[PDB]
């Protein structure tokens, strides 16, 4: 199986793009993001719901707890697909809706930066993150990234389009701060991670500013070519 | 795998470190993994450890969950590493753990849940992580046996009074009964059902360590060497 993580800002179009891909090839399957599932039943998802709501109310009390549980749920859920899926397929591809690196170098790092996590919580999380991925998540190494690039302003409208109730307060500032970090890591590539192979990973950046729900062929053609390059 | 893994279990100040330390010297084939939190009680672990301990003491309701996660992680890292580091050329290698991932959760984390310093979402979340993660290690850290060092709260208090740490001097006798009770259920009556199936069939040796054993441990070790020859 090849592993491709699909990255991008909130409401840039990842769920939608990934649900277009999985429909196109028996060799293509998807791992959605747990935090995504949490946003509306097994024990993980009641913890997910409670913990999500707690995070909305008092993020500086709950950011450490949330981050450690979101990533754990992602690490476990990517494994459920990599060890039990695409058994009878010729050129398997598993497409991750975000990654263990999104968890750390976008969201957790941004919470540390808005002081939702104190120094020690952040230092426990990075050590907890290094070890949890290296003990259990080795097989998760990514063969490439797809960055669905959407201006901060495109994203603000798309949460409006998504018309979810709890997400209309999101200031362009919050959405802009995630954008800058997304730009630094994947486009300008000025971010340093603690993972050496992430320095070299193939990366495909896709301008997803124009809507693509019924005009996505050119985007899908780029993915096919990018995949061949692996 | 060929290394025997034995937990030493006991309440605070029962004398586990004293025992462990005695044991390491009685044989070149006998090795010990000190409990990471006891050390905190200077790497980045000491730094992080140092802080969350003081934060934990300062406010149990805020830091209990964070502390419990890091203590159990730092423990697993000592344990899996000693496996790799010592006893590669021993014909009769035994590794003594100062406590286990079971005491983390079944003594300490449960206690803190029962005392409302972790809410339900933190305790089930903590339990989720412990369950799944120890189940990745199919048999690796899993115990060959357990040695219960059974003392009284008073001895432990008495022994707290002797250990000479003001930072502990205020630990209340009432907390010990609670902790002591949790040990007796798990290690004496065997009524603590857990979610690690092999445990209920892990042999337990119980030693009463109320009598001062420091100059006079030979009996205690005979019972340990007797126990090891049946595992
Ligand atoms: C529903 C998505 C999860 C949430 S909720 C949230 C949030 C909610 C309320 C907040 O204050 C009122 C908030 O403020 C953050 C801040 C005040 C800047 O520290 C963040 N940020 C986030 C982004 S954190 C996140 C998201 C995600 N998908 N994965 C990971 N690992 N972390
Ligand atoms: C992926 C980011 C989700 C975020 S981030 C966020 C947020 C971040 C920073 C903020 O100020 C710095 C913020 O303030 C919103 C406010 C201006 C107070 O209305 C909200 N709100 C949200 C919506 S919180 C939420 C609640 C909920 N129940 N479900 C979901 N999925 N999300
Ligand atoms: C960081 C100091 C260690 C502390 S502090 C502590 C504690 C401190 C103050 C408390 O109330 C003000 C407290 O609440 C008493 C209780 C009845 C649990 O609410 C617990 N319990 C503990 C033992 S936590 C522990 C020890 C250990 N060796 N291993 C693990 N996994 N956890
Ligand atoms: C492994 C420590 C275990 C415990 S448990 C404890 C404690 C727990 C609960 C308590 O009340 C419920 C407690 O007493 C606080 C009180 C007496 C009410 O002010 C102390 N303190 C401690 C140790 S605090 C400590 C210990 C230590 N070795 N070093 C430092 N710097 N701090
Ligand atoms: O080109 C697009 C991409 C997305 N969407 C919609 O915009 C919202 C946000 O997109 P999505 O959930 O895919 O973003 P994600 O958070 O998954 O990146 C959803 O209601 C989608 O149906 C759209 O109308 N056109
Ligand atoms: O036979 C003994 C065993 C222990 N102790 C004392 O009791 C205290 C607690 O011992 P230890 O640190 O070994 O307890 P642990 O927390 O490790 O069980 C220490 O001051 C020991 O010196 C003692 O006087 N005699």
From Swiss-Prot, chain B:
The modification Phosphothreonine is found at residue 43. SUPFAM superfamilies: P-loop containing nucleoside triphosphate hydrolases. It holds the Pfam family dNK. It comes from the Eukaryota. The active site is at 98 (proton acceptor). It is found in: Nucleus. Keywords: ATP-binding, Kinase, Nucleotide-binding, Nucleus, Phosphoprotein, Transferase. ATP binds at residues 10-18, 159-163, 211-213. GO terms for molecular function: ATP binding; cytidine kinase activity; deoxyadenosine kinase activity; deoxycytidine kinase activity; deoxyguanosine kinase activity; protein homodimerization activity. GO terms for biological process: dAMP salvage; nucleoside phosphate biosynthetic process; pyrimidine nucleotide metabolic process. Homodimer. Phosphorylates the deoxyribonucleosides deoxycytidine, deoxyguanosine and deoxyadenosine. Has broad substrate specificity, and does not display selectivity based on the chirality of the substrate. It is also an essential enzyme for the phosphorylation of numerous nucleoside analogs widely employed as antiviral and chemotherapeutic agents. PANTHER family: DEOXYCYTIDINE KINASE, DEOXYNUCLEOSIDE KINASE. This is Deoxycytidine kinase. It comes from Homo sapiens (Human). The gene is DCK.
